[model samples]
Target chain A: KLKLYSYWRSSCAHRVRIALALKGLDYEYIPVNLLKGDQFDSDFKKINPMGTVPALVDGDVVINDSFAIIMYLDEKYPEPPLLPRDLHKRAVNYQAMSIVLSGIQPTAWVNNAITKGFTALEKLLVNCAGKHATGDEIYLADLFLAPQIHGAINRFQINMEPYPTLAKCYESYNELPAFQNALPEKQPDAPSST
Target chain B: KLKLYSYWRSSCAHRVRIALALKGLDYEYIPVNLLKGDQFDSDFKKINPMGTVPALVDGDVVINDSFAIIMYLDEKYPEPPLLPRDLHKRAVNYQAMSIVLSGIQPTAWVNNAITKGFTALEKLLVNCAGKHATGDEIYLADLFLAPQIHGAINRFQINMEPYPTLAKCYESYNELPAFQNALPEKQPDAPSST
Candidate 1:
């Protein structure tokens, strides 16, 4: 059985949850409430010395980092691949995901909420021919964006006016059952205010 | 032929260069001087909309982000594998890499280079039983650590005494030609003062 240690409000945790749902994996959800300092527990810290939420333990194999967890999941469960087979297409897929993970995500919504955040993301989306970050098919790159978009709307309340294509793509992604199940508000640990 | 868009002082760019050298791949190095604001040039922005250094172009495919680019290289050129084949070991590898990329990076220096940066990383190395981040062999995890360690030691001049294991591991890693050749001081665009 897969055991996922996660917090409801964590964007990193939300990303992995989306991947788990998308893959149709039946995993046990274990909440580690950062608000209450559950992540700092000795046992939890042992599982993940970093004390970050969304650490997935598949038997003895433990993986953390939303990106790394998703990559591992994709490799182990290849039925629904997160990356494309074509080398060039895969590289493009990576480029899009990098813009989110490296460029936008590190801020958690502080600095990237405005300025280079939406403006640059919108620029990349301007050429998109699909309903997702890279193309019509939902892949790792799409998983990287939708949850952040969820926060951009629900938490940070960033203006979506400038990013029509991105808004349209994520609007479609936001409606998926996979994305729905991973919503921060829907998590077991979600507060009443959420 | 592969083409790498890089800057001398950027640790992110330095990571990819080390990977390329480690893999023994011949690639063209184009300097994107962040000091000169060349990353904002219209042509460079076309290649990587995020306007980050370490954007790699192989044939017609363009990939950015040090992590993504290394993954691509490991997938395509499997000679010198960046990740291991064992499931659990690979997860361990990912966890270590994440501590470097997601945990320590994003703060170019000043703050993270000291506080949570070396402190947390030192804690990670406390129980490390391997010559590298995960094991004896040099993998992507080491690639992630060595460059940042370079900046911590050479650029920011952080005291490595507190991080004995981290410093020791990087000390051994620094002796390798792959690391030596990819040093910031050795880059074509490295100023004489560096």
Candidate 2:
């Protein structure tokens, strides 16, 4: 069994949760309440020195960072692989993932920054997107994109008019049980009303 | 042949250059003078809408982010793999890479933020580091760490007394010709005198 240390509302944690759910991997969900500074606790810090959530512990191995955790999961459990096998297609997936992780997610607190990121994202995904950001099947890119797009609409209330491709992908993601189960509101630690 | 659009002093672009050199891959270096805002040029924006340097063009495929570009290169040209074969070691590589890319590099402008990131990094790498970060072989983590450590010492003039392991790894990295060629001062676009 895998042990995942996560916070309900962290977009980073949210990403890993979606990946685990998509892979059908069950894990022990240990909540680290960031609001109360649970991440700064000594015990949890021992598990992840970075004091960040979405740390995956499998047997003797403990991995921190959502991207690292997802990569570990994809390799350890290869059923319905998160990444495409084709080199070009895989590059596209990585590119989208990076855009969300580095470009959008990091600057999510600012509306203008989010808009700038979305503009670039829309331009990149316009030609490649089908049912999802990269293609019809959900790949590594979708895991990163779903949470950012979800946050952009629900938290920032950012206009989606400029990002039709990403907006469409968000709609597609919402239809999936895996993505829904990983939503912040659906977590055990989440309050009944937000 | 690969075409790398890069800024001479960008830490992100520096990482990709190190990766290319380590893999013994020759590329056409197209300098995008970020200081002159060349990244905003219409032609460059079409290649990478994010307006970021370190956009790699391989045939019809264009990868914008450094992490994405390196992953593509590793897969397409599998000589001298950047990641280890062992699952645990590979996870560590990803974790360290994330620590550098997400935690350290983004906060490079702030001294305290850099210290906080380096503190977490030293804790994470203490047990895993050998001749280089994660092991004797230079992997994905090194690609990210080398640039950040270089910037920290040279650009930030950060004290290295606390992070013995990372300091050691940086020393090892400096000894390599691959890493040497990627230094900001060595790039064609860099000013002759610092």
Candidate 3:
């Protein structure tokens, strides 16, 4: 059984939920209430010393880092792939996902790198917003954007107006079945805190 | 032809350079002067809005983020692989990669999250000592580690005596032709910097 330690409001946690749901795999959800400091618990720390939510236990193997986790899921369950076919295209997919995976987090939104994040995001999307971040398939890249951007926007009240392509891509992405279905609002704990 | 906008000293850039070289693909190197802050330059921003190093230009596609660049390369050039094969093993590989890729910079040497990062690294190594992070094998996971931890020591100007496995890993990593060949000093404009 794949058990994910997640918080409903966590953008990171949401990414995993989408991958599991998209792959049509069922998992047990063990919530770590970050709002109340449950992640600081020593037991949780044993599983993940980083003390971050969205930790996953796949049998004896524990994994975190949403991109690695998602990439692992994509490979483990190849059907209804979160990535595309072509090799270069897959590279592009990883690039787009990197915008959020690496570009958006501690580098930007966390350290007030919002402008930097938005700028990196803008350049990344404008340069390569063709065919669903790889080649026409709405893969993991888009699945990541919708909820993550939503968190970025909500957490810092960041305005997405500066980057039309990114904003458009994200807006269009949320409309997809996988993304729309996995929206954080749909989480069991819907009204999570900011 | 592929182009990499990279810093000579950055472990992130070093990792990608290693991958590109390992794949035996030809690529042009465009220096992004991290010291001079060219990453924020509007001209460079056109390539990567996030303005980080190791952005790859493959025809029309512009890939930002170091990990993404490698994933792109791995997918694009499958002959000389950078990742491990087995799915579960791959998870551990990525888990280590993501942890280092994410934690090392923000936490460890940056002194940003020093305790969190070091503790995380300690625990991570403890989990993967014999299992995943082999004392042998030339995987991208090791590629990502060498420079980051090496860069970490340099960035924070800390001694490596405290971390044994990391020190051993770095020592063993240098012996590999793939990693040794990609050392920062070997880059075209390998600027002498920390």
Candidate 4:
């Protein structure tokens, strides 16, 4: 059985959760509460010294970092691959995903940072987006964008009017069960009343 | 023919330059003087609205972000794979790569951030490192680490005694011609006197 160390409200962990759900892979959910500093615990540090959540443990093989974890699951599972088969389209996916992971999430607290990232995303997606970020298939781009767009709307309260393409993709992502189930609010560790 | 829009001193651009040299691929180096605000020019923004350095143009396809560009090159030119064949080792490469790209680079101005990232990398490399980061082969981890470690030592003047494994790998990277050619000072756009 695979074990995932995740925080309920962590955007990075949220990405891996959606990937796992999309693959229909069963895993043990091990919560590492960031607010409570569970990640700094010596026991958890043994799993990942970086103290970052969304660390996947598959028997003896352990993987940290959400991007690494998602890539691992995509390779191991192989059903409904997160990346596109076409190399050009795959590059597009990686570009959009990188925008979220690096461009936005790193300095999401800054409005200008988020706006700049969204502007780039909008320009990229305007050319390639179909029902989802890339195409009709919910590939790696959507997997990464869902959590980020979700956070921008709910957590950061950023307006979506600037990114119509991304806004459409977010609506499409919300309609999917895999993405819906992985929402931070739906996690086992989330507060019941909130 | 490939055209790389790069700034002389950008670490992200430096990574792609190293990858291109390592693959024995020739590319047209189109310098985008970031210090002169060339990245924000309307012409450059058309190439990458993100206004980031290291935008790669292959025929009609354009790829932004260092990671995306390297992955595209690795896929297109499979002569020397930047990633390992083994899945577990590949995950290690991704983890180490992410630590540099995401964990370290974003907050590199902060000494504590660099120290924390290096500490985690030291822990990771202790068990997996051979001559390079993951193994004897120079994989994705080495590609990402070279510029980061270079920046830390030359740019930030960081003490490397605490990270013996990384320090050794830095020495190994320095001995390579590919890495040598990609040094910031060696770029065509770099000031001759410097």
Candidate 5:
């Protein structure tokens, strides 16, 4: 059985949980409760020295980092590939993922940063977005796109009209079972308010 | 021929240059001087909407994110694989990379964050470090490791005595031509003082 050390509000953890759901894989969801400081627990530290959530334990393989976990899960399963087969498309996929990971997530003034970020995503998505960040299929970049956009809208109260492509992609993902299954509110450990 | 949009002092760009060097792949290094705000130029923005350095163009592929670029380069040239064959080792490798990417780079108080970051790397490196992070073979983790540690030491002046394994790994990496060729001072765009 796969064991996932996860939390509801951690978009990083959310990234991997979506991948797991998309692949139709079942895992025991073990909440690490970032709000309550469960990530720093002695036992959790042993599982991941970095003391972060979304650490997947399958057999003896313990993986951290949502991006790496996505890559690992995609390789291990290989049915619904998270990355595209086309090389250029795959590079575009990577570009969007990093936009969220490195660009949006890190900035101090995230409200302003995310606004600029959606602008770039709109430009990239002009040719790419169909139902997701990289064309019709939901892939690795979509995994990050769901939670991050959700976080931006809920946390920042930002208007989304300027980014029509991203707003449309956000709506499309909200309808999917794989994506809906990993929503913050749906997680067992999610707070009633979220 | 490959074309790399790079800057001499960008540690992120430094990561990819090291990978290109390790694979013995030749590329035209186009300098985008971040110090002079060249990244924001209208033409460069067309290539990477994010306007970040180390945007690599191979034929029609233009990718940012040092991590993703390394993954793309390694896959295209599998002669010297960047990721290990073993799943467990690969997980550790990812853990260390994220420790730097998300954990260290984005922190408000980076000087202190890097110290704590190195502490975790040292803990992970206790058993894993040899000639490089994740043992004797230099892989993806080492690519980030070199630039991060080099930045930490040179920029922050952190004492490496606390992290012996990392110091040793850093020493071993400095001896290689692949690493030496990608140093900040070696690039054609490097400032006379740097």
Candidate 6:
């Protein structure tokens, strides 16, 4: 059985839960609520020393990192492919995902930084929006992108007017059943998606 | 010819450079001095909205993620593989890589956030220091691990004694021709590692 130690609102944790539900994988959702500071406890650190949420425990294998988890799920499940078919597209898709993943890290500094980051991401949506991140497959890329993009925008309370492309991706992802299955609030112990 | 826009010290750039050299691909290296803040220069951001280091220009595709760049290079130039062969092993590898990638992002807060991040990384290395991370082969797990450990031990002035396994991985990676070639000093205007 898979055991996921996750937070209610962490997009990172949300990233995995969405994937788990999307794949119809069953195990357990063990809450390690980030709001309560459970991750800082050494007991939790044993599972993931960084004390981050979204730690998945399968057998003895415990995985962190949303990208790693997504890739692992895709490889293990091998259905509803999360990766693209062509080589270049796969590369391009990864590029887009990477940009979002690494670039979003520093924006936690301030409101202005978050605003600028999202503006940049909105434009990227124009440049790289395919099905999900690569095309219309509703793959995990969209799952990853939407929460990340939305997280920043909400942090700053900025309207998504300038990023029409990202707004579209947002609209499209919320429409999918896989995404709906993974919605933050829908989880058993999840808090409202802020 | 392929073009790389990079900050020699950025771990993400280091990962890509390592991959390029490992794959035996020759490419032009474009310098973006992050210290002088070339990353925010509008022209650079046009190529990469996040305006960060480690942007790749391959034909017409512009890639801006370190992991993605590594993934793309692995797919485009498949010789020395970053991913392992067995499927479960592949997942385990991703799990380890994530231990560095997402887990370490919180370094922004830790003292020597950069250095401590590496100190923390040695722990991850120790945990995964089995056949792959500890053994002969260089893996994507190593790509994320190398720079963080180097930065922690060198740039951030963190102690390496706590992380012998991480130090071992660092030493192993340095022994590789790819690691030697992709080093920061090889850039047209890199600061002396000395």
Query: A4-41 in candidate 5: lDDT tens per residue?
Result: 98898888888888899989999999988887889878
- Which portions of model 3 miss their true places by more than 4 Å? A46-50, A107-112, A127-136, A173-177, A192-194, B1-3, B25-30, B37-52, B59-61, B106-115, B129-135, B191-194
Tens digit of per-residue lDDT, candidate 3, span A98-178: 666665666554435767766755655565546454445667777667676788677777778887876777767655666
**Model 4, stretches more than 4 Å misplaced?**
A107-110, B107-110
Please write out the lDDT profile of model 4 over residues A116-143, one tens digit for every residue.
8889889888888489988889999888
The model with the greatest lDDT is 4
Tell me the RMSD of model 3 versus the true structure.
4.3
User: Highest TM-score among the candidates is held by which one?
Assistant: 4
lDDT of 3 by residue, B102-172 (tens): 66564543465644565566656654554225434567677677777767666677666666666677777
Candidate 6 residue-wise lDDT at B171: 71
The 0-to-1 C-alpha lDDT of every candidate, in the order given, reads: 0.79, 0.86, 0.72, 0.88, 0.83, 0.70
Off by over 4 Å in 6: A40-51, A105-110, A129-131, A149-156, A191-194, B37-51, B99-111, B129-134, B191-194
Name every residue pair that clashes in candidate 4.
none
TM-score of chain B of each: 0.90, 0.94, 0.82, 0.95, 0.94, 0.83
Q: List the residue pairs that clash in candidate 1.
A: none
Number of the candidate with higher DockQ, 1 or 2: 2
lDDT of 6 by residue, A49-89 (tens): 65656877878777667777778888888777777677766
Which of the predicted structures, 1 or 4, would earn the higher TM-score when compared with the native?
4
Model 1 RMSD in angstroms:
3.4
**Candidate 2 structure quality by residue, lDDT tens digits, A1-194:** 89999888899999999999999999999998999999889988777666677888898788888889999999999989898788878887877777777676665465898887778778778888479877789999889888888788788888887788988988898779999999999998988874
- TM-score (all chains, Cα) for each model: 0.89, 0.94, 0.84, 0.95, 0.92, 0.85
Best by DockQ: 4
Q: For candidate 2, write residues B78-176 as lDDT tens digits.
A: 889999899988988888887777676664564888898888879888898489988889999899888998888788889898999888889898689
Candidate 4 residue lDDT tens string, B75-191: 989878898888899898888888888888885564778898999899888898489998898888988999999888888889999999999999998789999999999999998
- In angstroms, the error of model 5 at B13 is 1.1
